[PDB]
């Protein structure tokens, strides 16, 4: 299948409370493998997956050096963005940056991306072509013009099409046991009385990987999407994921309902019926 590597950077100004908080995390597909936290003791990029722990001193020294460079850039960004929007000095603000790349089944470059946000809102984004920019507003225009002149896009395209996919492939190899696995969901249904004339039917999908999954309820084959409570897919904490969907069924109509499960790890979609 295809794969992705993505880095997430968050920077939060804390006026009169020291330098801004900076947090960086890296993911291959749905698996985290590194992190940096400016409030942590080490002041180094750190491993968050077993398959990356033995990468070696050169790798860790290099990522630590670069992630500090990122941290410092974002430290200046916060002042700059306050200066573009003429905002008060006492308020806390947030910058967010995400970049990464995807490879196909062949492990060929598929796409690259670079997105930037200020206070929870799109600010500037690299377009699909990796040659131009999309500015969210007027302030973002200043940046757009500045990066267009600094040929920053060319630099990113080089990274995304080169270093990014080269190392994604290396990680996929290194953690081929963790990353190149699919864990099919273990499923079951539960039944709980709501009254004397109603019951909650809950369809569970547990311990699956990757996170992508589809859980749907049907009554006589008709999608009950509007009457389904569906929680967000959530981490179990062990690298696997969980999800459930529930419907309230009039007591006695259980046999009309089926839960349908689709996951990459399954040979064919599952259809669960209470009976």
């Amino acid at each position: 299948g295809s794969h992705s590597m993505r880095y997430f950077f968050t920077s939060v100004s804390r006026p009169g409370r020291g330098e801004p908080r900076f947090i960086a995390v890296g993911y291959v597909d749905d698996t985290q493998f590194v992190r940096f936290d400016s409030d942590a003791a080490s002041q180094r990029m750190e491993p968050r997956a077993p398959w990356i722990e033995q990468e070696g001193p050169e790798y860790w020294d290099g990522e630590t050096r670069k992630v500090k460079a990122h941290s410092q850039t974002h430290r200046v960004d916060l002042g700059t963005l306050r200066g573009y929007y003429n905002q008060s000095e006492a308020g806390s603000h947030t910058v967010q940056r995400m970049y990464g790349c995807d490879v196909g089944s062949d492990w060929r470059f598929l796409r690259g991306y670079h997105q930037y946000a200020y206070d929870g809102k799109d600010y500037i984004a690299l377009k699909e072509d990796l040659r131009s920019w999309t500015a969210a507003d007027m302030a973002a225009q200043t940046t757009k013009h500045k990066w267009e002149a600094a040929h920053v896009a060319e630099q990113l395209r080089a990274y995304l099409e080169g270093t990014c996919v080269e190392w994604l492939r290396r990680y996929l190899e290194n953690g081929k046991e963790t990353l190149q696995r699919t864990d099919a969901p273990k499923t079951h249904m539960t039944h709980h009385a709501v009254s004397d004339h109603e019951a909650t039917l809950r369809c569970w999908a547990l311990s699956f990987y990757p996170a992508e999954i589809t859980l749907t309820w049907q009554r006589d084959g008709e999608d009950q999407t509007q009457d389904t409570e569906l929680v967000e897919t959530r981490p179990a904490g062990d690298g696997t994921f969980q999800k459930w969907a529930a419907v309230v069924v009039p007591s006695g109509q259980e046999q009309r309902y089926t839960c349908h499960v689709q996951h990459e790890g399954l040979p064919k979609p599952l259809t669960l019926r209470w009976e």
């Binding site: 967010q96 206070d119 904490g237 062990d238």
Partner: protein
């Protein structure tokens, strides 16, 4: 400025079985800004040995965090997650429904 309310789920890593070690999870997602207070409670009292994941975010830029602690469920022990955020006029307490 943008603000998004945290969604909260409280659950065990493995199916809950009395007398068997497990992890208690409180997953908070979809919030903004990142400042958030999350506590896990055993019988109304804050649990001290609680760790959390590294702050990350979703496609809409909203944040998510997993708070967790090792625990052994017992038939009578009560667990919950207490969450405070700017979008909340008061801290929300979600009880662990050891089902469902």
């Amino acid at each position: 400025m943008i603000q998004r309310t945290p969604k909260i789920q409280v659950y065990s890593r493995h199916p809950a079985e009395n007398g068997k070690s497990n992890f208690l999870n409180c997953y908070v997602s979809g919030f903004h800004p990142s400042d958030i207070e999350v506590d896990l409670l055993k019988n109304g009292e804050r649990i001290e040995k609680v760790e959390h994941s590294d702050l990350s975010f979703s496609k809409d830029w909203s944040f998510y965090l997993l708070y967790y602690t090792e625990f052994t469920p017992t038939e009578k022990d009560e667990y919950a997650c207490r969450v405070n955020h700017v979008t909340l006029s008061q801290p929300k307490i979600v009880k662990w429904d050891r089902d469902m």
